[PDB]
């Protein structure tokens, strides 16, 4: 079905997001923000729905996304959390933008009917 194949494409996009060639800016997003290890006493005040690439992977494998647009929304929640929490000139914001640039171009170009 178109949905199952578009989800497969989403896995492939996430796999590229994890690949070495994008690591220099993607890596802050590989895993949940460890608020305790980092001592971020204000993170949970500001970010009500944390998201990261490993969690998105787990949700795809547990079939939690109805379709590619629910996958995309979680990817964009990731980036939004980073834009919301950090100062706009912070290194991690630029890093999020560079990774978002890759994600948006791949996500936009995904076939509308990949099963065909």
């Amino acid at each position: 079905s178109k949905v199952s194949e578009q989800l497969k494409c989403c896995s492939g996009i996430l796999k590229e997001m994890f690949a070495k060639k994008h690591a220099a800016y993607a890596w802050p997003f590989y895993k949940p923000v460890d608020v305790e290890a980092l001592g971020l006493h204000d993170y949970c005040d500001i970010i009500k729905h944390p998201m990261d690439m490993s969690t998105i992977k787990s949700k795809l494998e547990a079939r939690e996304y109805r379709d590619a647009q629910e996958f995309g929304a979680d990817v964009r929640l990731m980036f939004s959390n980073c834009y919301k929490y950090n100062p706009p000139d912070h290194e991690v914001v630029a890093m999020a933008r560079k990774l978002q640039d890759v994600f948006e171009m791949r996500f936009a170009k995904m076939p509308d009917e990949p099963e065909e």
Binding site: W27, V33, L38, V92
Partner: peptide, 12 residues
Amino acid sequence: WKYWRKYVLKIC
């Protein structure tokens, strides 16, 4: 600090 392999980044 966040860490991944040879990379580090101050978030706090």
